[PDB]
Every structure is written in structure tokens, then in C-alpha cells.
Amino acid sequence: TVAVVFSSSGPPQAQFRARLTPQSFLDLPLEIQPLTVGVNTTNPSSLLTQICGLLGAAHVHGIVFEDNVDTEAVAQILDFISSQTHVPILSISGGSAVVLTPKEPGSAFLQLGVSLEQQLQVLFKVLEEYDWSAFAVITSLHPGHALFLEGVRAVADASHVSWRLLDVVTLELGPGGPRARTQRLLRQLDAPVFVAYCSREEAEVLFAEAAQAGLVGPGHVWLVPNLALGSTDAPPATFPVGLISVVTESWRLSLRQKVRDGVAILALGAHSYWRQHGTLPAPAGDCRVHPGPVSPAREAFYRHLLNVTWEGRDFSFSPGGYLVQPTMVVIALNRHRLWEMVGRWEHGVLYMKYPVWPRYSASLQPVVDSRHLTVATLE
Amino acid sequence: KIVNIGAVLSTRKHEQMFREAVNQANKRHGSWKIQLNATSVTHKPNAIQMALSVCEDLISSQVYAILVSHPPTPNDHFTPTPVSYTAGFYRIPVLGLTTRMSIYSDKSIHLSFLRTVPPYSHQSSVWFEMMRVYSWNHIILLVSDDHEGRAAQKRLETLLEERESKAEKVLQFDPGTKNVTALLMEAKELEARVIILSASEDDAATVYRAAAMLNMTGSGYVWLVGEREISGNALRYAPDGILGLQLINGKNESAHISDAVGVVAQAVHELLEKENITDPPRGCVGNTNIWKTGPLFKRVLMSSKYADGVTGRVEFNEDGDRKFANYSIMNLQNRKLVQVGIYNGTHVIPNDRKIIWPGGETEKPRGYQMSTRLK
Numbered sequence: 001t002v003a004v005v006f007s008s009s010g011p012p013q014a015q016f017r018a019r020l021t022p023q024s025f026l027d028l029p030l031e032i033q034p035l036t037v038g039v040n041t042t043n044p045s046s047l048l049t050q051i052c053g054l055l056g057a058a059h060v061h062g063i064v065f066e067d068n069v070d071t072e073a074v075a076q077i078l079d080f081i082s083s084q085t086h087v088p089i090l091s092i093s094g095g096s097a098v099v100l101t102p103k104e105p106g107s108a109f110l111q112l113g114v115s116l117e118q119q120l121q122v123l124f125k126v127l128e129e130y131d132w133s134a135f136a137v138i139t140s141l142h143p144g145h146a147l148f149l150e151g152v153r154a155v156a157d158a159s160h161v162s163w164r165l166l167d168v169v170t171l172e173l174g175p176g177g178p179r180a181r182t183q184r185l186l187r188q189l190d191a192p193v194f195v196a197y198c199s200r201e202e203a204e205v206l207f208a209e210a211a212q213a214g215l216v217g218p219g220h221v222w223l224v225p226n227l228a229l230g231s232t233d234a235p236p237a238t239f240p241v242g243l244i245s246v247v248t249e250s251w252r253l254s255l256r257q258k259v260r261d262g263v264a265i266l267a268l269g270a271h272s273y274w275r276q277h278g279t280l281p282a283p284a285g286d287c288r289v290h291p292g293p294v295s296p297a298r299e300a301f302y303r304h305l306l307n308v309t310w311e312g313r314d315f316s317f318s319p320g321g322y323l324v325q326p327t328m329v330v331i332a333l334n335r336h337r338l339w340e341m342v343g344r345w346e347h348g349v350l351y352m353k354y355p356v357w358p359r360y361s362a363s364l365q366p367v368v369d370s371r372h373l374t375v376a377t378l379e
Numbered sequence: 380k381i382v383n384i385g386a387v388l389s390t391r392k393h394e395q396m397f398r399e400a401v402n403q404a405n406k407r408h409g410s411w412k413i414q415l416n417a418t419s420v421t422h423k424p425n426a427i428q429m430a431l432s433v434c435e436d437l438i439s440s441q442v443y444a445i446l447v448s449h450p451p452t453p454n455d456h457f458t459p460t461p462v463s464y465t466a467g468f469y470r471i472p473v474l475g476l477t478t479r480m481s482i483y484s485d486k487s488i489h490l491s492f493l494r495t496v497p498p499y500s501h502q503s504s505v506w507f508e509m510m511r512v513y514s515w516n517h518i519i520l521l522v523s524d525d526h527e528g529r530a531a532q533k534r535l536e537t538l539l540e541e542r543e544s545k546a547e548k549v550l551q552f553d554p555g556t557k558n559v560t561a562l563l564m565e566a567k568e569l570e571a572r573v574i575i576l577s578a579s580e581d582d583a584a585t586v587y588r589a590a591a592m593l594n595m596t597g598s599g600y601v602w603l604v605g606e607r608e609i610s611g612n613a614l615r616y617a618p619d620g621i622l623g624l625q626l627i628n629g630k631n632e633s634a635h636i637s638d639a640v641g642v643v644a645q646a647v648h649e650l651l652e653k654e655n656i657t658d659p660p661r662g663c664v665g666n667t668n669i670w671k672t673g674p675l676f677k678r679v680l681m682s683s684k685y686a687d688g689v690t691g692r693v694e695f696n697e698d699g700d701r702k703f704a705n706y707s708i709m710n711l712q713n714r715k716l717v718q719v720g721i722y723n724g725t726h727v728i729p730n731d732r733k734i735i736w737p738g739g740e741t742e743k744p745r746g747y748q749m750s751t752r753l754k
């Protein structure tokens with residue numbers, strides 16, 4: 001059996017009711033009859049109370065999660081639950097998409113996202129392709145920045161370029177702080193491209209200071225990882241035109257389509273088990289009543305669930321619980337304040353769509369250069 | 380106003396001992412401006428039941444801080460984690476005063492967590508210091524594979540690379556694994572004659588027994604271990620002369636409570652002399668928004684110096700941990716631990732006794748016996 005959890009909603013309940021009846025919706029070869037549980041006002045009390053309340057009955061063989069972005073503390077709670085009840089779980093959403101690097105020794109969180117290092121790998125392919133080769137790194141004092149700061153220095157060593165990095169700057173960008181001190185460090189800067197790493201709340205503060213110090217015009221371009229962007233669709237004000245960020249393939253999709261992908265992994269993994277070892281691994285999970293002394297059998301079902309291919313995609317996971325070699329894409333902010341797919345990254349080679357970076361200006365009106373001209377040859 | 384703080388403890392006697400401390404703290408520097416409270420709970424076997432009971436405590440009080448202990452330890456690791464996840468959701472600053480696991484220092488997972496005792500990772504600072512004083516320059520490291528051990532590997536390397544020493548032959552082994560003689564034999568033909576061990580109480584017993592068949596405990600060779608290596612079921616099998624170490628007043632579980640309330644009380648008065656204090660939310664259920672000034676509380680709490688500490692000076696580092704802690708060296712003679720020195724912050728000062736090396740000799744056995752036969 002497969003369970004589905006709704007943890008955030010501007011009420012789609014027509015879609016929630018659409019998922020009540022279809023016990024024969026999927027073509028996957030298994031008993032995929034789903035049971036749905038709704039959640040209002042997600043929080044440690046409601047989330048914990050309802051989760052094994054539904055797990056206390058029906059002997060469910062896995063959970064699928066979904067919630068809204070901008071909540072981060074809910075990532076650990078799901079991991080904590082799976083450490084006791086010994087039931088595999090899968091998260092497909094924006095909230096719990098960010099990857100926790102240390103997981104509990106006997107947990108099966110099975111997150112669905114990309115690590116911070118993997119995002120940096122794609123960005124440096126973009127940077128070297130246009131041969132900017134000169135950048136400055138700006139990071140706030142957000143938890144996990146030290147992990148990120150080791151990413152650039154390590155990756156810049158396992159490559160073949162000069163990679164002349166100028167300087168690294170750190171500054172507190174919360175609701176309260178001395179803007180003059182950050183103004184001193186920001187104005188004292190000179191670099192073509194910037195690689196910034198900040199949360200969404202810091203991002204609005206940072207870019208507000210950027211325009212005041214004159215670091216926004218067509219003479220510069222910015223790169224930020226997957227974290228700093230908005231929800232997906234409505235970017236706020238002060239986000240400069242020409243932003244760049246790398247996002248996984250499911251960037252643009254419908255919530256109902258994501259769930260079918262989520263159930264597919266559990267269904268395909270379960271059926272694959274029957275062919276190899278046999279007969280529907282024992283589905284069992286319990287809350288506080290005598291939970292999880294040791295797992296000699298479910299731990300064997302864990303390995304089968306890692307590698308899975310469906311509809312021409314590869315979803316192989318790592319012991320760290322994050323995707324390995326997914327088909328990432330790159331997006332940018334055009335002159336309509338939308339997000340446009342710029343270039344794919346498939347099978348280790350980086351494609352593109354713009355042979356040159358169109359560099360905007362204060363009021364649209366593309367900027368084009370005398371010293372740069374297009375050459376046509378043949379073999 | 381009324382400021383309310385809570386705590387989770389083990390015994391009802393300790394809970395009453397906690398309440399007596401806050402009463403004396405109130406009478407120390409209190410006035411008619413702000414008064415304090417206390418609230419206490421007890422452990423439960425199922426961690427899920429604790430987590431529900433944690434904010435049963437929270438609905439009953441405008442909690443400003445929490446305290447946690449684990450004097451009974453069927454699971455020394457999983458006891459203080461449910462409070463951290465539940466309280467960390469609202470950025471409630473939770474203080475832990477007896478727990479030495481190194482996982483709780485990674486602030487990316489636990490958003491708010493502090494300590495009054497350094498963890499096992501900071502232990503290697505004294506190890507490197509004894510190397511400089513005694514002039515040992517060729518060491519063999521021996522560590523487990525869990526996160527508890529991997530932290531020690533990184534800590535020693537950055538402390539040694541500052542002088543370009545590059546310790547040799549770091550060996551790893553899966554925890555809970557018997558028959559480690561397949562690994563010790565690889566360390567039998569190595570030049571270095573001093574071993575540094577860091578593992579759990581169950582693994583340390585095995586390697587002590589496994590060394591008995593290899594003559595690894597004989598003369599000329601010198602062992603040195605950590606706190607957990609010689610406190611448990613492994614001490615009976617330990618070879619004499621292992622220069623271990625311990626904590627000054629760890630496991631007290633009573634002096635820490637006096638220290639914890641003192642630093643907390645100094646912080647709340649220092650913070651409340653400001654603007655826009657908004658109080659935490661009332662209720663585990665019915666709310667989704669974090670305490671708007673939670674990070675501000677942890678920020679000011681970091682640098683709150685404390686003078687009249689029963690354990691001593693109390694201060695915090697950048698990550699959050701009791702810095703400038705005390706360490707008391709041991710030595711195993713005739714199956715009885717005897718102190719042979721004291722570590723005080725930065726340096727070591729031994730006296731009053733003669734160190735008994737494992738072979739029974741009375742002169743400092745240097746390592747690095749140059750192997751004459753080459754390959």
C-alpha cells in the first residue's frame with residue numbers, strides 16, 4: 001500500500017478529491033490503491049500526531065510527501081520519524097527538497113534533489129564556456145556556508161583553468177545590521193561576475209544594497225544556487241535581470257504529475273523485488289509501541305529501491321539520499337521578469353541556446369558591442 | 380514581567396534541586412523588574428512520546444530556554460535528539476549539559492543547540508600537545524568509521540598541517556566488527572611505535588584482546604587513548620601503562636545546573652534591556668511562524684561571560700561549545716587509574732609521580748626504530 005500526504009495548499013481540493021478514487025490510475029504492475037491524508041497548519045504537533053495515526057492502521061508500505069517552499073525545519077522531522085517506524089519515505093516538494101548531508105544511521109529518508117556540490121559543478125561549466133574566468137564569492141553567515149565555501153576551492157582545483165578568483169566577502173544580511181559596514185565592503189569591489197549564496201530573505205536585502213552601490217547594470221552578471229530563488233514562478237522586486245540559477249528537471253510541472261512519479265518509484269521498486277527475491281516485501285510500520293529494535297529484512301528491500309528507471313529517466317540514488325546524475329537545466333530572468341529555460345545538462349556535456357550572453361541595460365534596449373563579430377566558414 | 384524557562388531532567392530529586400538553584404539565582408541580582416519560573420518533565424522510553432510531551436511542556440509555559448540531561452543511558456545518542464528537533468522548529472534556544480556526541484555540533488542540522496562541556500572531537504588538542512612536550516614525531520592513528528570517529532581524523536590533520544608534520548598510516552575499521560587482526564598486521568611492519576586509539580567501549584575491548592596475540596602490548600611500544608576507551612567493559616582487558624585521560628568534573632549532573640542557570644539569567648537581563656522583545660508563541664498546535672527574535676537570543680547568549688563558575692570559567696566558541704575546559708591525565712598501574720598530570724586550557728603541567736610505561740621500564744621510550752631490512 002502507498003500513502004499520500006498533503007502538507008500545504010491553496011485549496012486544490014478538487015485535485016485532492018481527484019486522487020481519492022483512482023485505485024487503477026497507474027499502469028504500474030502492483031496493488032497501487034492509495035489512501036490520502038490531509039494536513040492543515042503543518043507543525044511538529046500536527047505532523048507527528050497524524051503521521052503514525054494513519055500508519056497505525058492499514059499496514060502502509062511507504063509514504064510520499066509534498067509541502068510548500070520557505071519552510072526548512074520540516075526537513076529533519078520527517079527523517080526523525082523514519083528512523084523509528086522503519087518505513088521508507090519519499091519527498092517530492094520544494095520545502096524538504098534541500099538536502100541534509102548527515103542523515104541518521106538507520107533512516108530511509110530518500111530525498112529528491114541535488115547536493116550543493118553538484119550545483120556548483122554545473123555553474124563552473126557555464127562560467128568557463130564564456131571564459132569569464134574571474135569572479136568574487138559573496139556568502140552570508142547562514143548555516144552551511146562553510147560547506148559551500150569548500151566547494152568552490154575544491155572544484156577550482158579539479159579543473160584546467162587559471163580560475164583567478166579575486167576575493168571572498170562575508171557580511172550579515174538579516175533584518176537588523178549595520179548597512180554602512182556592508183556598504184564599505186560592497187563599494188570596495190571590482191569584478192565582472194559574482195557567485196552569491198544566500199537565503200531568500202537575505203537575497204532581497206542583498207540586491208537592494210547592490211543597486212545602491214551600482215553593482216546591477218549590464219557591466220555585471222550574477223550566479224546563485226537553487227536555494228536563493230523564489231517559489232518557482234513569481235520573482236520579487238529588486239531581483240536583477242539576467243540572473244542565473246541551476247534547477248532540476250522538474251522545474252516546471254503540475255503537482256498531480258509529480259505524485260504519479262513518486263508512486264512510480266515505490267511501485268516499480270516493489271514489483272522489481274518480487275521478480276528477484278519474491279512475494280511483496282513485508283509491509284509493516286508502527287508508532288511508539290515497541291518500535292524498531294533492528295531491521296534484518298526491510299533493510300534488504302532498501303537496496304532494491306535505490307536504482308530505478310522509468311519513462312526514459314534515471315533516478316539512481318546515493319547512500320546520502322540525494323539524486324545521482326540527474327538531467328539538470330539552467331534558467332535565467334529575461335526582460336519580462338519570467339524564467340526561461342536556457343540550457344540543458346545531459347550525460348555530462350553542457351548544451352546552450354545563446355552563443356553569447358545578451359547583456360541588458362537600465363531600460364531594456366539590448367546592448368550590443370562594436371568589437372565583436374560573427375565568422376562563417378566551412379571545412 | 381514574568382519570564383518562564385523550563386527543563387527536562389532525569390530524577391525528581393534533581394528537578395527539585397534545579398528549582399532551588401533558580402530561587403537563589405533570583406535572590407542574587409533580581410529585583411522588581413522581571414521575575415523567573417521553572418518547569419520540569421521526565422524522560423520516557425519511546426522518543427516519540429517524549430516529543431509530544433516536549434511541547435505539552437511548551438503549551439503550559441512561555442518557554443524561553445530548555446535544559447536536557449541523560450543520566451540514564453540505554454542510548455547515549457538518541458536521548459537528547461527529540462527535544463532539539465521539536466524546540467529547534469521555533470528557534471527556542473535549548474541548552475545541553477551532559478552529552479558528548481560530535482553530531483550535535485553541525486549547526487546545519489540542529490539550528491539551535493549549546494553546551495557546557497566540550498565534545499569528543501576537541502579531545503585531540505591535548506594529544507597533539509603531549510606530542511610537542513614529549514617530542515614524539517612518528518605516530519600511527521587508529522579510528523573507527525562512524526561520524527563520531529571521522530571528526531577526530533579531520534581535527535588532528537588541520538592541527539598538524541600547521542607545522543607540516545603529515546602523520547602516517549591512518550587506519551580505519553568498521554564499528555562493531557570483530558577479528559581486527561587482519562588490520563593490525565598491516566601496522567606490524569611500520570616504523571612508528573606509538574598508537575593513538577579512538578573508538579567505542581565495545582570496539583576498544585576487541586582491539587585490546589586482539590593485540591594480546593600480536594605482542595603489540597610489549598615493551599618499547601606506548602599506547603594513548605581517549606576518555607571512552609578506558610571507561611566501561613574494556614578496562615578489564617586493558618594493558619597497563621596506557622596514558623589515558625579524563626574530564627575534571629564530568630558526569631556530575633549537579634554542578635552544571637548551577638552553571639547553566641547563571642549564564643542564562645545573565646543573558647535574559649542583558650537582552651531585555653533592549654527594544655522589540657516579542658515573547659515566544661503559546662502552543663505546539665495552531666501556529667506555524669517562528670519566534671521573530673529567536674536568533675537574536677542565541678546571538679547575545681554566545682558571548683555571555685560568567686565568572687563565579689562552580690566548574691570554572693564558562694565561555695563559548697564560534698560553533699557553540701564550552702571552551703577552555705580542564706583535562707586530567709591518567710595512567711594504568713596494577714589495574715588502578717592514578718593521576719599523573721593536569722591539562723589546563725593550553726598547556727600541560729605534570730608532576731609528583733613517575734610515569735610507568737607499558738613495558739615496565741622507567742625511561743621515556745622513543746619511537747621510530749629504523750628498520751634495517753628493506754623492501
Ligand SMILES: *[C@@H]1O[C@H](CO)[C@@H](O[C@@H]2O[C@H](CO)[C@@H](O[C@@H]3O[C@H](CO)[C@@H](O)[C@H](O)[C@@H]3O)[C@H](O)[C@H]2NC(C)=O)[C@H](O)[C@H]1NC(C)=O
Nearest residue numbers: 380381382383384415416417418419435436438439440441
Ligand atoms: C510558574 O510555575 C508554576 C509551576 O510550574 C506554574 O504552575 C503550573 O501551571 C501549569 C499550567 O496550568 C500546570 O500544569 C498543569 O498541571 C496539571 C496537574 O494535573 C496537569 O494535569 C495539566 O495537564 C497541566 O500540565 C502545573 O501543574 C502548575 N504547577 C504546579 C506545581 O501545579 C505557573 O503557572 C507559572 N507561572 C508563570 C507566570 O510562569
Ligand SMILES: *[C@@H]1O[C@H](CO)[C@@H](O[C@@H]2O[C@H](CO)[C@@H](O)[C@H](O)[C@H]2NC(C)=O)[C@H](O)[C@H]1NC(C)=O
Nearest residue numbers: 272273276277300301302303304305306307308
Ligand atoms: C536494480 O534494482 C534491483 C531491485 O532490487 C536490484 O536487485 C538486487 O540485486 C542484487 C544482485 O544480486 C541482490 O543482491 C539484491 O538483494 C537485490 N535486491 C533485493 C533482493 O531486494 C538490482 O541489483 C539493481 N541493479 C541492477 C543492475 O539491476
Ligand SMILES: *[C@@H]1O[C@H](CO)[C@@H](O)[C@H](O)[C@H]1NC(C)=O
Nearest residue numbers: 557558559560561562564592
Ligand atoms: C579471523 O580470526 C582467525 C583466528 O582464529 C584468524 O586466523 C583469521 O586470519 C581472521 N580473519 C582474517 C580475515 O584475518
Ligand SMILES: *[C@@H]1O[C@H](CO)[C@@H](O)[C@H](O)[C@H]1NC(C)=O
Nearest residue numbers: 567590591592593594595597
Ligand atoms: C609474539 O607473537 C608470536 C607469533 O605472532 C608468538 O609465537 C610469540 O610467542 C609472541 N611473543 C611472546 C613473548 O609471547
Ligand SMILES: *[C@@H]1O[C@H](CO)[C@@H](O)[C@H](O)[C@H]1NC(C)=O
Nearest residue numbers: 628631632633634635689690
Ligand atoms: C558534583 O559537584 C558539586 C559541586 O561542584 C559537588 O559538591 C558534588 O560533590 C559533586 N558530586 C555529586 C555526586 O554531586
Ligand SMILES: *[C@@H]1O[C@H](CO)[C@@H](O)[C@H](O)[C@H]1NC(C)=O
Nearest residue numbers: 627690691704705722723724
Ligand atoms: C581547572 O582549570 C583552572 C584554570 O587554570 C585551574 O585554575 C583549576 O585548578 C583547574 N581544576 C579545578 C578547577 O578543579
